[PDB]
Structures are given as C-alpha cells and as structure tokens.
C-alpha cells in the first residue's frame, strides 16, 4: 500500500492576497493524514486524497508527513510566507500566536518568485504515544486520544509587491504524502470534508 | 538557539527619498522576547557570547 501513500496529491487551496497585513494567519492545517477539503460541483463529489484513502482503513497511524506547497506567481510578484509547526494536538487555541512568537516553533520561510516552485515541508514525528488513533469513528471528544500531532500555520511574512498589470494575488496548492508511514489494526470508515 | 527567527517587517515605498532609513533595529534586544524559542535559554542565564547571522 505504499504505492498510493507515497504519491503527493492535492489537499488544500488558498490565496495569498496583496491586501493582508504582516503576521496575519492565512490558513491553519491539522497535521494528520485524514485532512482534505476539496470538492467538486458537477458531479457532486468530495475529492479524497490518496493518503486519506489508505489511512482511513486503519485504527492507528505513525510516520512523517510531507507537505508540498506549490505557488503560482508571475516573475513579477514578490513576497514571503512563513510555514510554522506548533506541536500538540488537533484542539489547541492557536490563533493567539503572534508572528514573533511563531519563530519559537520549528518553521521555514519561502521566497515566492524564483526558478523553483515547490517547498517540501517534512514534519517530524512528535508525540507522547507511539501511535495515534483514528478517532473520527467516534462522535464525542475525549482528553487523551487524538488524531493529529499538532497544527500548521501559514503567515504573511513580507507583503506582496507587484506592478499594476498583473493580478493582485498568488494562489498556493497544498499536497499531502507520507514517508516512513506505518499503519495497523484495520477497520472500515468513509471520511468527510474538513470544513475548518 | 541556533535557528532563524523573524525579527522585523518593514516596507519600502516610492516616497522614501535618498538615504532614508527604512529599518533601524537593535538585533539582540529583539531576540530577547517571550515569543521566540531562544528566550527559554536566555531568561535563566545571565551572560552570553555569540555570533549573529542575518538574512
């Protein structure tokens, strides 16, 4: 089953506007293989990823998730993003973290316009338990059992400078694969769109 | 301790004249703040001796 899980497939889609302030949190991502939010209109469908199709058929997962951020600028936009990883779980009050406080956590910057387009953000396995449970079968929360190993924040590091005859925003795709993935204890479950 | 931290964000305009000072910042005082991970090493020690890498 590593034939499907090691394929980077699209999970998210967010714009980087020119009308946002420095330090504003653009998007927050829960760090688990069960995350996807894309959908289609005709036909009515909920676009699964190749990693969330294999991992939904197990109880416990473990490994290093690899996020891939592909930008679509021209040669004339100019800006930076800050990709921060706050270790923890999928329920922490994370919106109070300022831009200067986010550099305490392990992070990485990215210059947008250049000859390369993709930054690969391999998240290390940080946990207190050796494995992490598929809790989405249940319907109530419980302190101690979780699905994620933290949340990933995207900041506006430098503003987006551009001329007048280009568009005033840059869109970023988010891909999702896994290295050193280990799953066991099978079940059946059909996932759902994380509406965030 | 040895990890890049964002310390300042300025913006360069067409109205700033020649030799105008876009950023004037103390480097070591801005790294001595609670929001960075290096504070947990510097809050409890007294003296230090260090080199600086700027980007």
């Amino acid at each position, epitope marked *: 089953f590593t034939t499907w899980t090691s394929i980077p497939t699209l999970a998210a889609q967010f714009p980087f506007n020119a009308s946002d302030s420095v330090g504003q*949190q653009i998007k927050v991502i829960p760090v688990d293989p069960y995350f996807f939010q894309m959908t289609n209109t005709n036909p009515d469908q909920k676009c699964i990823t190749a990693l969330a199709s294999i991992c939904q058929m197990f109880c416990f997962w473990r490994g290093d998730l690899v996020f891939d951020f592909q930008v679509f600028p021209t040669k004339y936009h100019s800006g930076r993003l800050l990709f921060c990883f706050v270790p923890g779980n999928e329920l922490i009050d994370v919106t109070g973290i*300022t831009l200067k406080q986010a550099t305490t956590a392990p992070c990485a910057v990215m210059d947008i316009a250049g000859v390369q387009s993709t930054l690969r953000f391999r998240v290390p396995w940080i946990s207190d338990t050796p494995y992490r449970v598929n809790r989405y079968t249940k319907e109530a929360h419980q302190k101690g059992e979780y699905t994620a190993i933290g949340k990933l924040i995207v900041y506006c590091y430098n503003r987006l400078t551009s001329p007048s005859n280009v568009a005033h925003h840059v869109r970023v795709n988010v891909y999702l694969s896994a290295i050193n993935l280990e799953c066991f204890a099978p079940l059946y479950h059909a996932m759902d769109v994380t509406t965030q | 301790g040895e990890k890049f931290f964002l310390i300042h964000s300025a913006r360069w305009l067409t109205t700033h004249a020649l030799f105008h000072e876009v950023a004037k910042l103390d480097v070591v005082k801005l790294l001595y703040n609670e929001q960075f991970a290096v504070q947990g090493l510097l809050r409890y020690h007294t003296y230090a001796r260090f080199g600086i890498e700027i980007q």
Partner: antibody, heavy 121, light 107 residues
Framework: EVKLVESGGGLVKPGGSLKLSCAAS????????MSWVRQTPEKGLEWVAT????????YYPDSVKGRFTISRDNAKNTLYLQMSSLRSGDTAMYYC??????????????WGQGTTLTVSS | DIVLTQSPAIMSASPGEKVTMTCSAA?????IHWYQQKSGTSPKRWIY???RLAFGVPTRFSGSGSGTSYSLTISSMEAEDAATYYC?????????FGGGTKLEIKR
C-alpha cells in the same frame, strides 16, 4: 470581502437581559478571534470582550467582568454577547470586530455596522 | 490603568498644508495603532503597529514616535480626510483608546 452584520439590540429596562448576535461571512471564522467594542457619544471607546478560536478562552476588563458573557458557534459562524444586570452606563453603540495579528501585537481590521442599546426606564 | 491622551482635540486644516496630531501615553508603550471614523459609519483599517499603513489608505500619511510620544503626520491635506482619528494600545489589560481628534476642513 469581510462583512460583519450585527443583530439584536433595542430598549431594555435596567435590570433586564438581552443577547446580541453578530454574523460572519466568506472568510474563515475559526482562524481569528472576535470582539465587542462600545461607543458612547460622550466618551469613546471601550472594549468589553474577546473570545478565541474555540470557546475556551475569554477575556474581560475590570468593569464588565461578571456581568457579560461571550460565546461562539463555529458551525453557524455567529457571535453572542449575553448581557445581564444592565444599568445606565450601558446605553451606547455596540460593534462586533475581528481581532487579527500583527508582528508583535493585535489589531482590529474589520468592524460591523453596530446596533444600538438603550438602557433607561 | 494606563491612559492615552490626544493633545489636539479639534483641528482645522486647509487643503494643501501639513497636519500633525499626537497621542501621548502615561508610561512606555511599545506600539500604538490608529483608526479613522468618518461621520455616520464605523472605524476602519488605518495604521497598524506604528508606521505601518493599511492597504487602501493614501500614501501621504505617516506615523512615528516611541516610548511616550506618538504622532500622525499628514503631508498634504485633501478633502477626503475630514474624520476622527483614535489611537489604541495593547500593552496591559484595559486596552484604553484615545479620546479622539476631530479633523475638519478649514474654509
């Protein structure tokens, strides 16, 4: 474009209780903390509440602590301000605002239209 | 527990002159923000941390100062600026705003 639309508000006798409700829009409601700011025509302004992403952490100043209660519903994208034990100091204009991050501190980008509360008998 | 006092309360201005207002604190404050309130509406995105202009604002407004004294400087006055300008802190708990400086067009 962010569109915050307040609702509720009117005439309450001093001693009654009323619940306000702001309403969110296109941009993501969980990524930001919200607030309530008070406009009197004589003096201004005074901030009264802020609740974070989840409904866990709430913050209040010295005056309205114990009287007011802020809440969220993250599926309905609405705010709620539960005001109890009203008096003559609460006849003013109430805005819902969105608190956002800067490099070192916080800042309110987008405010609502504002509803009017008149507390007198 | 900490008070922001704006030293001009009402100011008149001719179109094309230099306009400067002040928001003084009572202790050391790191950053002070600004808001513009035109008559009949709500305040807007005006000036974040100290000198950081917002997006849609004109490029002839300024901000400076540190510690106690802080200022908002207008290079060339126009007719689109007849409004009220509040200041705000974020250091300690009460988050006290400024009293308000009303800028009106001199005729």
């Amino acid at each position: 474009e962010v569109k915050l639309v307040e609702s509720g508000g009117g005439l309450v006798k001093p001693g009654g209780s009323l619940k306000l409700s702001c309403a969110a829009s296109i941009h993501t409601f969980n990524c930001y903390g919200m607030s309530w700011v008070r406009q009197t025509p004589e003096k201004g302004l005074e901030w009264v509440a802020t609740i974070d992403a989840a409904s866990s952490y709430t913050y209040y100043p010295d005056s309205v602590k114990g009287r007011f209660t802020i809440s969220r519903d993250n599926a309905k994208n609405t705010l709620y301000l539960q005001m109890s034990s009203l008096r003559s100091g609460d006849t003013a204009m109430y805005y819902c605002a969105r608190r956002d991050n800067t490099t070192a501190q916080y800042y309110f980008d987008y405010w609502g239209q504002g509803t009017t509360l008149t507390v007198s008998s | 527990d900490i008070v922001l006092t704006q030293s001009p309360a009402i100011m008149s201005a001719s179109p094309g002159e230099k306009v400067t207002m002040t928001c003084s604190a009572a202790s050391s404050v790191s950053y002070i923000h600004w808001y513009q309130q035109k008559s009949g509406t709500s305040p807007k995105r005006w000036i974040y941390d100290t000198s950081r202009l917002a997006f849609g604002v004109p490029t002839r407004f300024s901000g400076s100062g540190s510690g106690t004294s802080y200022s908002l400087t207008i290079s060339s006055m126009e007719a689109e600026d007849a409004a009220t300008y509040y200041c705000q802190q974020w250091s300690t708990n009460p988050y006290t705003f400024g009293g308000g400086t009303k800028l009106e067009i001199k005729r």
